[PDB]
Amino acid sequence: MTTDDLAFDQRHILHPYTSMTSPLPVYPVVSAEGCELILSDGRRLVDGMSSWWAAIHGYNHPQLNAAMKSQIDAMSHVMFGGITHAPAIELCRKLVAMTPQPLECVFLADSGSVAVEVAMKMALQYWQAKGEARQRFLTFRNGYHGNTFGAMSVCDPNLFAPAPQSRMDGEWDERDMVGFARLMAAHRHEIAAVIIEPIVQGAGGMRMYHPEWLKRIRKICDREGILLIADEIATGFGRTGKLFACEHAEIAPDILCLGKALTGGTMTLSATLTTREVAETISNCFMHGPTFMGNPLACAAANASLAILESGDWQQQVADIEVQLREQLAPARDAEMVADVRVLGAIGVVETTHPVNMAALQKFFVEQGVWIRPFGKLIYLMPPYIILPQQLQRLTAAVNRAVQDETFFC
Amino acid sequence: MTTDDLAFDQRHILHPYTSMTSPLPVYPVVSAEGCELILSDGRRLVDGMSSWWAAIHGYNHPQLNAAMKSQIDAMSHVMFGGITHAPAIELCRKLVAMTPQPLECVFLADSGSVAVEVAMKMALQYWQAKGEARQRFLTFRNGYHGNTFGAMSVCDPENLFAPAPQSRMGEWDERDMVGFARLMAAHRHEIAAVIIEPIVQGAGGMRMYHPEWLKRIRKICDREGILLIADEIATGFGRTGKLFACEHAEIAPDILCLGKALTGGTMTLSATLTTREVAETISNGFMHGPTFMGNPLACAAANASLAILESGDWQQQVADIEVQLREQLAPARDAEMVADVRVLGAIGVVETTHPVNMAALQKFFVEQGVWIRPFGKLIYLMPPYIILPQQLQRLTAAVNRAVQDETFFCQ
Ligand code: NA
Ligand code: NA
């Protein structure tokens, strides 16, 4: 990559959440292996982000590589309309078996937002088939479910209950419920579904709430006849310490959305699983179909990623990561720029009192030989499960150092 | 693929537009090469669909394959936030260079529907930035722009819907404009953008209309200061006989959407291009970012796919496909089940008077050693540009056979 290459990027290529008139530096990566990103100039960086949740087995993993290459030798893509193939079947089997008993019907899609839209369309068609006037969704404030038109309608600015005040680390307080009870009482009759991110509210605040909330929501839904949609696009596949974050409340949703880590972070794929009751009611078809539904290559990558998780090794890896993050992020509770430190599984969050200075903190991080990407008042880690203790220690040392003074804040 | 495997597919895997209470048969594909799909039972089928527009170079293409394998060797994925990489830069260079001059800012995304949602959002953020109350989109009836909620608000039934373009790809009839002008006069103050598929309305009826429509729409938008969104997710990359269908009218939109054939049908990827005016104007007031934005593997596949097109061979491959389709579909105009026949580039459409029987028709095609996937009252062909004449002949003969009587119709 030349500097002329980098100039073209600034002038012509839009990047996520960022100006075309004031783009900040972007770093050129040429390759990646294990837990390291390799920059154009040869510098190797320990990845603390898993490229946004997804790369749980890291990069250039031999099992993912082999599977993707083999699939390419067979066929990279073929349409799913009237057709089926081994990768899609092998994947859907693993998905049905690893999720709660009632979730046995699979709608594969391309992106998470699209998987959420499918979930919403599923809830709307469901009630319409019963002849009921239910077009409204009840969600939490601070929630995040995607970029698209429908996904945006249930995002922190339908009906919005307050964000869950009670914590995963701490105690349950009953006052938390008053707002969601008030909303449901007033609206039980027009509500099609409650859509929520279980335990961890990712993009909306990296909040971790007490599992009693999920227990409570599940019973209220059962009682009123209302559908529950669990958005696990960020939480699935072992990130919070359990395979799926719902397991934390011992509950099953009516509709489950998955993505990000599904393919081991090699390429995009998503899935929306539901119950037979929902799947059959709607057909009495579900009106949906992305062009690349069931992509064999993305399914093959996903199958190999799940096979690595079938060993169970991730449980110990994630538990170890949890203990190391708690121990090593704790000192930050004492720095002047930190407001809160919270860990669950392989998620380590240091919330600050003032917002960060993106360009400056990013450079500091790259200088430390680590890749860490902050947003707002949050400096967080979500590393790959195969990260070595030495590598994890480099990440926490860098975070602890960043919050030592106001050099990198505002 | 065992039978247990096939049974699990039927009871647990949703397929596009198709019931889970009354599922219809599906065919197990184990591999694909050239212009052929290979079933589990060993049967080879000539593909007439390009896996819905996308696989313009067929399957197991040695150049596409080596490119993908090489990128997997470097890295299949890395986040695009704060990071850039060779595959995305090379791709955006090609996209900017091959599209009309004003289109120079690229937003890479995953699926077509998302690319469209991005365009709509751009149009809204834009007027908001200029401080204009503009929240209506004006579109054509019979349009298709994707499956997400925003995309559906401009799919044929609050937005404005002008009558479906009547003049055919045919002489022009000024009366065709009455419905469109009326809406414009009444709501010109409130319209954020006009959004249409150029020349070919795909999923909404495989309709083929007159390029004068684009000249007029471009001129009217110019005059009122309204944004023009051209959805070329289906028509892009040579399909209609020109590189982009907008070329038929030698017009440039303010916003351009691309997908499907962008990667040569190896994996999903999409892109929305717009002008500097739009990108600078939503910037001095863009709120979008899919997780896998800029995915290196998909970008590498698109680079190798665009490199094949760089040779220019598609132009004559498509011209020859068009001559063959017109000649070989002509006999369908003598069949009792046909309502209309129309051809443009490597697209051949036989519209029927009654809806097809999917299960029965699909099986018939498979027995003829061809893969053709109809829908509603349309039996159409969009083959890979590399299809051999003997292969295209097998497709057109199967279509002609299918429309001779009631057999494969209704249900
Ligand atoms: Na299950
Ligand atoms: Na251009």
mmCIF file of N, CA and C and ligand atoms in Angstrom, chain A residues 94-105 273, ligand 1:
data_model
loop_
_atom_site.group_PDB
_atom_site.id
_atom_site.type_symbol
_atom_site.label_atom_id
_atom_site.label_comp_id
_atom_site.label_asym_id
_atom_site.label_seq_id
_atom_site.Cartn_x
_atom_site.Cartn_y
_atom_site.Cartn_z
ATOM 1 N N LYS A 94 -26.330 -27.481 13.752
ATOM 2 C CA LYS A 94 -25.585 -27.033 14.913
ATOM 3 C C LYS A 94 -26.359 -25.944 15.656
ATOM 4 N N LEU A 95 -26.931 -24.994 14.908
ATOM 5 C CA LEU A 95 -27.726 -23.907 15.487
ATOM 6 C C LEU A 95 -28.968 -24.362 16.247
ATOM 7 N N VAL A 96 -29.687 -25.341 15.710
ATOM 8 C CA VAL A 96 -30.897 -25.829 16.357
ATOM 9 C C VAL A 96 -30.524 -26.550 17.662
ATOM 10 N N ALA A 97 -29.490 -27.372 17.592
ATOM 11 C CA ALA A 97 -29.066 -28.151 18.752
ATOM 12 C C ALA A 97 -28.486 -27.313 19.900
ATOM 13 N N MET A 98 -27.730 -26.268 19.580
ATOM 14 C CA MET A 98 -27.047 -25.469 20.595
ATOM 15 C C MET A 98 -27.923 -24.383 21.268
ATOM 16 N N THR A 99 -29.096 -24.103 20.719
ATOM 17 C CA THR A 99 -29.984 -23.098 21.295
ATOM 18 C C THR A 99 -31.103 -23.831 22.020
ATOM 19 N N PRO A 100 -31.892 -23.121 22.809
ATOM 20 C CA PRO A 100 -33.036 -23.717 23.517
ATOM 21 C C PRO A 100 -33.945 -24.580 22.653
ATOM 22 N N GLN A 101 -34.470 -25.646 23.265
ATOM 23 C CA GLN A 101 -35.312 -26.670 22.634
ATOM 24 C C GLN A 101 -36.365 -26.099 21.685
ATOM 25 N N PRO A 102 -37.158 -25.128 22.124
ATOM 26 C CA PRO A 102 -38.194 -24.543 21.265
ATOM 27 C C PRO A 102 -37.701 -23.823 20.009
ATOM 28 N N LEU A 103 -36.456 -23.372 19.974
ATOM 29 C CA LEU A 103 -35.942 -22.649 18.805
ATOM 30 C C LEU A 103 -35.427 -23.660 17.808
ATOM 31 N N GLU A 104 -36.239 -23.992 16.818
ATOM 32 C CA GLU A 104 -35.884 -25.052 15.891
ATOM 33 C C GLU A 104 -36.094 -24.715 14.417
ATOM 34 N N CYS A 105 -36.514 -23.482 14.118
ATOM 35 C CA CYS A 105 -36.717 -23.014 12.745
ATOM 36 C C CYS A 105 -35.763 -21.858 12.387
ATOM 37 N N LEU A 273 -33.743 -17.402 14.490
ATOM 38 C CA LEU A 273 -34.392 -18.661 14.836
ATOM 39 C C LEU A 273 -35.705 -18.387 15.527
HETATM 40 NA NA NA C 1 -32.802 -25.135 19.563
#
